[PDB]
Amino acid sequence: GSHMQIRLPHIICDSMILQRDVPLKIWGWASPGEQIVLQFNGKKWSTKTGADEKWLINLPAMKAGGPYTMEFSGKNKVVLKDILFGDVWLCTGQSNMVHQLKVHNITYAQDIASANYPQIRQFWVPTTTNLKGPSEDLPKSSWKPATKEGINDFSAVAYFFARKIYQEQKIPIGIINSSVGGTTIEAWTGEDGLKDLEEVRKIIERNKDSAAVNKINKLADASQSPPATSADKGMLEAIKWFDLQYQPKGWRKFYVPGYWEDQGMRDLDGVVWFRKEIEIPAAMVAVPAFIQMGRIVDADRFYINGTLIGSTGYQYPQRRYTVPAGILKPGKNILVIRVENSNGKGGFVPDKPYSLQANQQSIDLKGEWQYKVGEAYRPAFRGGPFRIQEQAQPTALYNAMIAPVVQYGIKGVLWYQGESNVGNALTYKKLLPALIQNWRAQFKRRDLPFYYVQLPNYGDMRYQPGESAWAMLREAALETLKVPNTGMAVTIDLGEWNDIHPDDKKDVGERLALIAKRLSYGEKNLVYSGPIYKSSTIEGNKIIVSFEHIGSGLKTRDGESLSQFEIAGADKKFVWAIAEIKGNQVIVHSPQITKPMYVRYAWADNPVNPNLYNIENLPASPFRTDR
Amino acid sequence: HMQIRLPHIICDSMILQRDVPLKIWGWASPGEQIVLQFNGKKWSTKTGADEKWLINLPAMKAGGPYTMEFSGKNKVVLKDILFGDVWLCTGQSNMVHQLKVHNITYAQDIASANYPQIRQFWVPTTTNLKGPSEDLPKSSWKPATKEGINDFSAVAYFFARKIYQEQKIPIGIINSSVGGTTIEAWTGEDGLKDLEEVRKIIERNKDSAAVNKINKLADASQATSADKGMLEAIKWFDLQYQPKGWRKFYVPGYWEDQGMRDLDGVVWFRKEIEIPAAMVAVPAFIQMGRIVDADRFYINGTLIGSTGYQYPQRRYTVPAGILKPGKNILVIRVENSNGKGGFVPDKPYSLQANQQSIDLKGEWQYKVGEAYRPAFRGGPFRIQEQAQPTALYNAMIAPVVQYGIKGVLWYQGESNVGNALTYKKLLPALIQNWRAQFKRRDLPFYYVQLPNYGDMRYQPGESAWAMLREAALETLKVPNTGMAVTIDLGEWNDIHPDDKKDVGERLALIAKRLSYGEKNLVYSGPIYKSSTIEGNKIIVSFEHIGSGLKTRDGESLSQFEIAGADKKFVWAIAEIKGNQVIVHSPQITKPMYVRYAWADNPVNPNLYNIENLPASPFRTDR
Ligand SMILES: [Mg+2]
Ligand SMILES: [Mg+2]
């Protein structure tokens, strides 16, 4: 890593949006003693590279605007063009901030097609880890605009946030998108924020020891069983089951949607094939076709008339296959789906779209299919030992994808994470404030705005009160409002029972934009939160609940009675309660609870009808009054 | 008794057993002389002080009709009496199942049935905890013609029709069967005396005070409906109801699998469908599969059908005038008290009218009417007489021990999978008990090995159903018995499979060989005899190979497993070599045990003989 000439950090490149209204640092590397001259804003700026091969130029604050160029000269020449000054938002978290407009392009087709915001730009950070400590540079990437060429790669949440802020504030908006699916808050926290967790602390130190890491990976590889040979009859028989000439023998009836565990196939992991013959009118031939096959657990190959038209390797993507003209023929067509399933309930997720579309016509793909098992996997032990997976390691993502930008000026942080911490949801009460204060320390921005997303509803619904790990995670977010300069978007009405990646990203980004408009952009009278539990008092057989953020008043979303309220006495055995808005408060009681002491609202993974709002249509946070 | 009284089985249209000395018995006042006029001759006996009389008649050849005129203080005349073969057809619900509940598959058999000399005497469900009853409940002998065919047990009818077509004598069916019942309830006291825990129950149940003390304990020691769909001012089937708060559901399926966790209670389902004019002003037929547990089905606010429990197939006939042109509203209220509520998959869901059909699978809307709170389900409960040892034997078998019969058909066991190991002893004990009580130590007893049922598995495993089938297989040691294999006739999703015809006709093969002397008839599929170990092979020998072993589908032999000493079975290669199957697995270098079709529902049990009868499942480990 000897620098022989000027090198700029990857974030300092063409089209960047730099932070307006703050002293700016322009830093980089070069050969020792190399004389750097920067031509910028009608002036020349000079510095000498140190013996550490690093250089730094300090520039005075700039107001929003542009475009500018910068010309750097030393032993080489570097020219940067199309530089703007505006507000740079660091947008971070796991897969629901990762999720890009291109995978929500049915619902947001019109937003994608009309996006013409050349001064909203995203710098997307590839997934990167460093077990040794903070990295000095992000991976190579580019600043891409919210226009035709780059809109599809924007984080959907970040785009709808940025679009709302831009329309009202009218300054360039930069998005540093640093997000990785399936990751924990510990992986995103710098070492100093985790030092009080003794077991995590020891892992951090072990991971800096290459010998120790290599030992664990060796014992993982040594014990790693060899690759398994496929026993798939559908591929290994003389005629493959997608071959147009195959004659089904031994196939049974199946119904889409559904899981095969629920259709007569017990404890089965492996490969199951599905076959359906459908009649296609001539009007859907010789044109492109579009297949929506819901969501499949775990992986599928989809063949039409023997031709592979689509594949998805894992359970999370929605199946959306574009079929070229000429595959479908008039009359009888053979659809064959090979479903591979390595763990849990394989099959076709219900409450999802299953259809084939062409020429503004649609054919239903739900209903009767035929199935035959191609392979059943024999059970085996699967608990380890495992190699050290870097993105699961504490600090590893912070080090490589956050630490390199600490010198880059930023306006604030948007954070949407927690799905991967529901197993230590109680601990998250400490983990979230620790991350906030860690990033503030490392950025040297003790005032840095940090706005986060409370987890949405997800999972099976229940019709009796019960305990909930998701609810505990939502409480950790609620209680973190004690940290100065924070805000929380409630999303309990935006999720889906059957998907951890819900489609409605627009309302997430726009609810975060309300927080920013009030707290970062000084819109002092803007209602930016739904009702937030403040306090409660017991009066006889009733509990009276007071709230902050009532806007112009409390209401129910549907005009029906308040739902999802519970009440309990000293024994904490909760029952569904009667709840009624009176003035600015909610009165809770149950004829079954004589001496009530505690109230819960929307305390579940997926409350059926959380209908407490303010008149400004923002949902109340779930809460409990017991501790 | 001050007037002559005949047992309920001795009545008009009765089929009496041919070719045996016959007993005709009854009651009258003490000392009353009873005179029977029959077959051109008079018979006389005197009623004893115990109010009972008996007349012994000589054997009769098959035929009829005859009359019997009894004269005591009053006269009784019976007419339309036939002599033929009387089969006592017994067991639980798959013997109960009547042609009327299989009238889609057997519509034409029902329509064309014209056998006035095949007659069924159906016994209503009855129990007696005190001991053997002396009379059956009132019933009648009904013929297999249009007026009585629908009430025939389907298994018994298909047996009787096959026997009649070849043997050409009147066939009587004494149908004594009760759903959900155990073999112990069907066994007389003497057959259970060696099961000490059962014996103690038999004696307790004879003590009416002791039973009442338990029942009155239950009447003290053991919830209000909150169904919004019935209790809101506008009920959810009212045509004017406006759905608010309804969500999407997909039929077939269980709600546990569509987002409603741990939910017992009442869930309502709503679908609006477009009806073409050709389907209006004519009768309509709704098949709504099978529903767990109970349902009420409304169309345009009018209740068109209901079923109170999970077992019946839903088949509702809707009169002309309910359906209208255009938009029609279907509303189903489903109640579920235990287990997974909803709509059973792999069932028909459709509306038919005027040769057209509309799919009822697909997207419905749902809303929960009520969710039952958890509560203790263990009672205590009153003593249920149908569940008590001897209680069904006492009231539905014991009263006919003096009636001449040809043989017994038995189809039971589903309710004994919980003590399947004990069934190895219970089945021979019932056979020997009935033989003793009927004073027929040679009585033919032909039974049904349980069919396949339940979820399929793709790895070897244990199975209580398989143990129940082994009990049947091993009971073939008892003389004058025979077993029908049904491992290919059941259904994965129903304990009441539709194919009753093959059950009855496989039993008829057993009777034709063993009761009607058809010497060279192949009447059984291959039956495991023995096996030997030769290196890494186990060679299995079979009886009843007919004209040879084969596979049903022409593919490799399926469902064979092999294990070594540790009894860890793996799927094995199996090949037919004569009257033998050579079993081996490359993984098992020291094999000791073989299993075939050892599962609740073997995927492809394909070992047959050339005459198309299935081999019995078996294991060689014990
Ligand atoms: Mg599976
Ligand atoms: Mg249930």
Residue numbers in the entry:
A (entry chain A): 20 to 646
B (entry chain B): 22 to 243, 247 to 646
Q: Can I see the authors' text?
A:
We determined the full-length structures of two members (Fl8CE20_II and PpCE20_II) from the carbohydrate esterase family 20 (CE20) by X-ray crystallography that feature an ancillary domain, inserted into the catalytic SGNH-hydrolase domain. Detailed structural analysis identifies a so far undescribed catalytic triad architecture which lacks the typical aspartate for polarization of the histidine but instead reveals a precisely coordinated water molecule mediating contact between the His and Asp. This coordinated water in the Ser-His-(H2O-Asp/Asn) motif, as further confirmed by mutational studies and by determination of kinetic constants, is crucial for catalytic activity. We therefore term this active site architecture a water-mediated catalytic triad.
We were able to crystallise two of these enzymes, Fl8CE20_II from Flavimarina sp. Hel_I_48 and PpCE20_II from Pedobacter psychrotolerans, representing the full-length structures of the ancillary domain containing CE20 enzymes. Based on our SSN analyses both CE20 enzymes are categorised into cluster II associated with xylan breakdown and metabolism. For cluster II, the CE20 from Pedobacter psychrotolerans (PpCE20_II) is encoded next to xylan processing enzymes (GH10, GH43_1, GH67, GH115, CE15) and the Fl8CE20_II from Flavimarina sp. that is located in a PUL which is already elucidated on targeting glucuronoxylans (GH27, GH43_10, GH43_29, GH95, GH115, CE1, CE6, where Fl8CE20_II specifically shows activity towards acetylated xylans). The structures of PpCE20_II and Fl8CE20_II have an identical domain organisation and a highly similar overall fold (RMSD 1.151 Å) with a scorpion-like shape due to the geometric orientation of the internal β-sandwich ancillary domain in relation to the central catalytic domain connected by two linkers resembling a tail. Analysis of the surface electrostatics shows the ancillary domain is highly positively-charged, containing several Lys and Arg side chains (Fl8CE20_II: Arg313; Lys370; PpCE20_II: Arg314; Lys371) facing the active site of the SGNH hydrolase domain. In both crystal structures of Fl8CE20_II and PpCE20_II, representing the only structures of CE20 enzymes featuring the inserted ancillary domain solved so far, the Asp (Fl8CE20_II: Asp513; PpCE20_II: Asp518) carboxylate has a distance to the catalytic His Nδ of 4.0 Å which is too far away for a direct interaction. Accordingly, we propose the following catalytic mechanism for the CE20 enzymes with ancillary domain using this water-mediated catalytic triad: the His base (Fl8CE20_II: His515; PpCE20_II: His520) is coordinated by the active site water molecule, which is in turn coordinated by the Asp/Asn (Fl8CE20_II: Asp513; PpCE20_II: Asp518; called anchor residue as it forms interactions to the ancillary domain) and the main chain carbonyl group of the ancillary domain (Fl8CE20_II: Tyr334; PpCE20_II: Tyr335).
